[PDB]
Amino acid sequence: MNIFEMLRIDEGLRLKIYKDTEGYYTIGIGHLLTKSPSLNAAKSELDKAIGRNTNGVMTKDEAEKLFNQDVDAAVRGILRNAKLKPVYDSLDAVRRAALINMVFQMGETGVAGFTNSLRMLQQKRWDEAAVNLAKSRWYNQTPNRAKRVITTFRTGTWDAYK
Numbered sequence: 001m002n003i004f005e006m007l008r009i010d011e012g013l014r015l016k017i018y019k020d021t022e023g024y025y026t027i028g029i030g031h032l033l034t035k036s037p038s039l040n041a042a043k044s045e046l047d048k049a050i051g052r053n054t055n056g057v058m059t060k061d062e063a064e065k066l067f068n069q070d071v072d073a074a075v076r077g078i079l080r081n082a083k084l085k086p087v088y089d090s091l092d093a094v095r096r097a098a099l100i101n102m103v104f105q106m107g108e109t110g111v112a113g114f115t116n117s118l119r120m121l122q123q124k125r126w127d128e129a130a131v132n133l134a135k136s137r138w139y140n141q142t143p144n145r146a147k148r149v150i151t152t153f154r155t156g157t158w159d160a161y162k
């Protein structure tokens with residue numbers, strides 16, 4: 001299992017514009033298009049991302065492509081972040097994937113806000129961080145996914161995705 005497969009599981013794959021759990025326009029593999037309420041604004045961000053006049057639909061290949069960019073960007077956002085980098089650097093490979101996932105779903109900024117959890121993960125206090133992570137809107141709004149990520153940090157294995 002790896003980051004890609006992991007996220008493909010959490011996010012799914014849709015080739016037509018759709019609304020995410022927060023009601024925002026999205027497409028592909030969890031690729032947020034816009035927070036605006038306008039579908040055109042969305043269509044417009046789509047065309048611009050892909051480089052062609054799409055009419056709200058895309059191919060698998062295009063989806064995979066945005067997905068690769070998005071992953072790359074998340075990692076890079078983590079590395080450029082003064083609060084995240086050190087966490088990430090201290091983690092093992094599995095757990096890093098968990099941190100990427102969160103970053104991918106919530107943005108660097110969102111994640112950089114879990115100060116306390118972060119600190120706990122840095123200290124390798126697994127059970128405690130898992131508790132702390134759960135006391136969040138994130139967990140309350142998308143509890144199944146949060147559970148998967150949290151177990152991953154708690155155990156350092158992929159069992160939640162098997």
Ligand SMILES: [Cl-]
Binds near residue numbers: 049
């Ligand atoms: Cl883009």
Ligand SMILES: [Cl-]
Binds near residue numbers: 142144145
């Ligand atoms: Cl969920």
